[PDB]
């Protein structure tokens, strides 16, 4: 039941810099006082960011294919951007996993689902209810479910600083999905600040389906509604990094190889 | 025992540990067909 | 997932929740988290 909104504007696909973001822990192991090399699909330094500035007129809910995972980031003030439609064909026939919440606990579910053209959370501004969480349409040839930590999680609309910064990495790997978490207090008007934040090896998943397409999920303030917020898209690249661990076991500096002759000389 | 099957028509190879239940009525350039159309079959194949 | 021969003492880490190993100079594990919540350096050079 493609309960699809119509005032979903096309932006000019606003472009930004991918300066120093996307660093995580490649191993599961302490080290100290090294320069560690590894070869992996990382977001390069300084590269493009296709940022999506959904505003009071412009709404940003496209469909995007997978394409070596994404560096993901979202500036939400009490959590609009829950949900990812990591699907195959975006119809009833789709090998789709959906990453959503029951506002307390994290509900992730893979099956051949009916993918509507825009299912929406009919979220109101002062309360924040998923009254129309109609996404669980069909169940035929079903695969998988998962329920994570129940933790502190809000819905409703705020403003101020970009209070919650979701720095995520979504990375397909040998069938699995590897999903990382960061957090940062940031305050920019609408855009990305300059800074790095080490992402944590949080969620590794046994899924194993051909994940082609994806959509993002926001909260349509019930007719939609958005706050002063933005969210970003970055693509990964099979490059080589030299990391600098400290004695605390905290990433303090990263250096790509395929970026600058000085950068590869640093990793040389 | 024709109850269980396999699939034998696809655009190419795969990455490890990856699965599609989707009965695609295959045609060699996309083209969602209804068999019995030309180059339009289904991949289902019994075990004998 | 480890074997070996060594001299045990407790750790001095900022050890992580997902974490077990230390590989200090390179790939030689040099600190382990016990499976029943202890933080123990593994100085394997017994004496030589």
UniProtKB/Swiss-Prot annotation, chain C:
Domain of life: Viruses
UniProt-reported outcome of changing residue 47 to A: In strain: Isolate Tor2 and Isolate Shanghai QXC1
General function of this protein: Attaches the virion to the cell membrane by interacting with host receptor, initiating the infection. Binding to human ACE2 and CLEC4M/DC-SIGNR receptors and internalization of the virus into the endosomes of the host cell induces conformational changes in the S glycoprotein. Proteolysis by cathepsin CTSL may unmask the fusion peptide of S2 and activate membrane fusion within endosomes.
Name of protein: Spike protein S1
Gene: S
Residues shown, of full length: 531 to 578 of 1255
């Amino acid at each position: 039941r493609c309960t699809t909104f119509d005032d979903v504007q096309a932006p000019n696909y606003t472009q930004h810099t991918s300066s120093m973001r996307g660093v995580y822990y490649p191993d599961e192991i302490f080290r100290s006082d090294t320069l560690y090399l590894t070869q992996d699909l990382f977001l390069p330094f300084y590269s493009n960011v296709t940022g999506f500035h959904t505003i009071n007129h412009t709404f940003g809910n496209p469909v995007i294919p997978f394409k070596d995972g994404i560096y993901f980031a979202a500036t939400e003030k009490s959590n609009v951007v829950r949900g990812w439609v990591f699907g195959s064909t975006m119809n009833n026939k789709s090998q789709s996993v959906i990453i959503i919440n029951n506002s307390t606990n994290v509900v992730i579910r893979a099956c051949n689902f009916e993918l509507c053209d825009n299912p929406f959370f009919a979220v109101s501004k002062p309360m924040g209810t998923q009254t129309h969480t109609m996404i669980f349409d069909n169940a035929f040839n079903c695969t998988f479910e998962y329920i994570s930590d129940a933790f502190s999680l809000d819905v409703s609309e705020k403003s101020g600083n970009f209070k919650h910064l979701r720095e995520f990495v979504f990375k397909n790997k040998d069938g699995f999905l590897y999903v990382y978490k960061g957090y940062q207090p940031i305050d920019v008007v609408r855009d990305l600040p300059s800074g790095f934040n080490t992402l944590k090896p949080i969620f590794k998943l046994p899924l194993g389906i051909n994940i082609t397409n994806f959509r993002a999920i926001l909260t349509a303030f019930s007719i939609w509604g958005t706050s002063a917020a933005a969210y970003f898209v970055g693509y990964l690249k099979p490059t080589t990094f030299m990391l600098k661990y400290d004695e605390n076991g905290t990433i303090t500096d990263a250096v790509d190889c395929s970026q600058n002759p000085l950068a590869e000389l640093k990793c040389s | 025992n024709y109850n269980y099957k396999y699939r034998y028509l696809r655009h190419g190879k795969l990455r490890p540990f990856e699965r599609d239940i989707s009965n695609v009525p295959f045609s060699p350039d996309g083209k969602p067909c209804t068999p019995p159309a030309l180059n339009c079959y289904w991949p289902l194949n019994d075990y004998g | 997932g480890l074997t070996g021969t060594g001299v045990l003492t407790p750790s001095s880490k900022r050890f992580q929740p997902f974490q077990q190993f230390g590989r200090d100079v390179s790939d030689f594990t040099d600190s382990v988290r016990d499976p029943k919540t202890s933080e123990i350096l593994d100085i394997s050079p017994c004496s030589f």
